[PDB]
Amino acid sequence: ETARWNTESAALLALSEIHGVSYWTLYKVAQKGIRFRDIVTSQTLANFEYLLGVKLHRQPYYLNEGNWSVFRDSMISTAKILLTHYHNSGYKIIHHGSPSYPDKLNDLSEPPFWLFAQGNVSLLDKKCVGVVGTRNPTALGIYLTQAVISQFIDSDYSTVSGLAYGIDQSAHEASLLFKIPTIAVLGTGVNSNYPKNSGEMRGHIVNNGGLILTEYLPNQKPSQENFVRRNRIQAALSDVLIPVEWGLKSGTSHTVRYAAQLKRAILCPLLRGTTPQEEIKHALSEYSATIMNIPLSDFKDVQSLIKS
Template identity: 40%
Template sequence: MSDSTQPNANAVHQDTLPGLGAGRKESLHPAPEMPFGPSLLALAKAPGLGQKGLSDLVGCLGRDIGLLLEDDHIRTLATLQTAKIANAHRVAENLAQGRKDLIEKGRQEIERLAERTITLLSPEEIPPRLRALPDGPRWLFVQGNPEVLDDPPYIAVVGTRQPSQLGMKATEAVVRTMAAYPITLVSGLANGIDAAAHQVAVRDGVTNVAFLGHGINVVFPAETGGIRQRIVESGGAVVSEYLPDDHYKRHFFVARNRLQAGLSNIVVAAEGTASGGTAHTVRFAARYQRPTVGLQFDGAGNLAELVATQDTGEVVKIFDPAGRRHLDQRFRALCTDVGKPTNGLALVQHLLDREMKLRDIPRTDLEQLTARLRRLIEETS
């Protein structure tokens, strides 16, 4: 979403996450009976609390927010006041009066989410790369496989919602280069570059992580519903830090961009302008010291120029064979750095397996392929 506003960590929350590096004191009380997930969803429905209040409470209590749903009005009020919740007395009264109903609603909602393979990660369960951010998420809703959020390396491919034909081809070139290696694609499931990156990744066997700028129950834009389902079915994850039914807002998308940058080892800015929405991701990447690659080609816009001004940025001519090889070398080196095996012909093998399933391949065709491989081995020896 185009928006020239500078990325603002304070728009998400202002303090470092407690329990995630900011010294939340150990509770003097026993652990609450209510687990984190149903507690969060119960408190989300409490009148007078709101999104900010809920975030502040998680900041104060971490996974122990269920303490607020126990029958201890004095302690509840004291906790609300410690967390500097506005109208703490009124919120405490609302909790006291509606406690049983809230608890039942929280439990029912967490069960409905689980039926759709949606997991709610508590502060301590948030993946390390995101937990280490100064403005990281308080919690995460994950549809699909949450384990992919802690299995680097990650490369974000992001760009405009209104790409050119060359921009779409450039995006495909980047993802196909990734597909040879055990790399997970990160993007935002928006129309344009994001959707194209996810589609090519699913096609070529690349695992996907898609960050949403709205609640996990919302499908937006509607055109991405199919690719979202394929991401989940192929072992990837769709992720949101917003409450399940939260509708999309402009500042939600800006904040979402910080998670794309924060999780990634490299951010590839495929196409866009220095004043567009993708520029936020580039700036977040610079803030978090994530290497950024801007793609250069005819009509690419000036986003690559913004990337070039960043200390960790570089520009690659994606349709130049030398530029494509350079990108391949970076991706291979990234896998090596995190201890993942590399095979530059893994995509070729994937395509061969697919062709074998779709075609009636005679033995002679395989013999020709074998002969060609032998010649290539001799040429490289």
């Protein structure tokens, strides 16, 4: 069974890394039920380009009948070693339709048809709580992030965030601090160094039983489109979504909307004694969200301790 998916893995890397096929091109290929293995084993360039869904080239073209066999065989041979190269770094490619693929992602209209993974894949199949927010939080947003995640200590939950500046990085840092496994869904390929000084955090995430996850091909750069596209994954994986600090018509609003479309539970942190803002009121109105008081405790619980 292993060898079937490894052949599809190598075909994906062949088209992506060697021939440079776009994410979108390969996505709609897989969306149609076309397997990359049968694209790379095409015996003509016409067949190649038909299955790949691009505009067929006329003559003259540098790819032709005279050099097709080597073009095909050399790319298959190249990609087979390239996958062992990525396996050696601890990366796994999880394909849609395989046993390792998590059910939750098939709630999406556009499920990822492949995933690059580094770390503990079994977390995708277990309870997850998304913690996400602005890349430019206030001091209180940073605290609420940690306070929220501390509530899940010794639960069966892991955390999910996007490894981005601000709330997301504070979410991962908090999960690590409290020894909650955390999942980072990237807006890049696995090879990128974004965000700054990310290689150590990714290391600690993996060392603490966490997971690095991305739908994007190894060398895909960060982009505003890549982030919004990735947030459908974050919403789908989040059994509960907790947007800590966020404005409407923001990145995180997309995630919250998606979570509402996916009928995920939505909790909104509110510090004791403070007034909900319209983004919170929006979530209670639209998405049937729920306030989560921080602290959840009352001061009466503190009084019990002081005066025994």
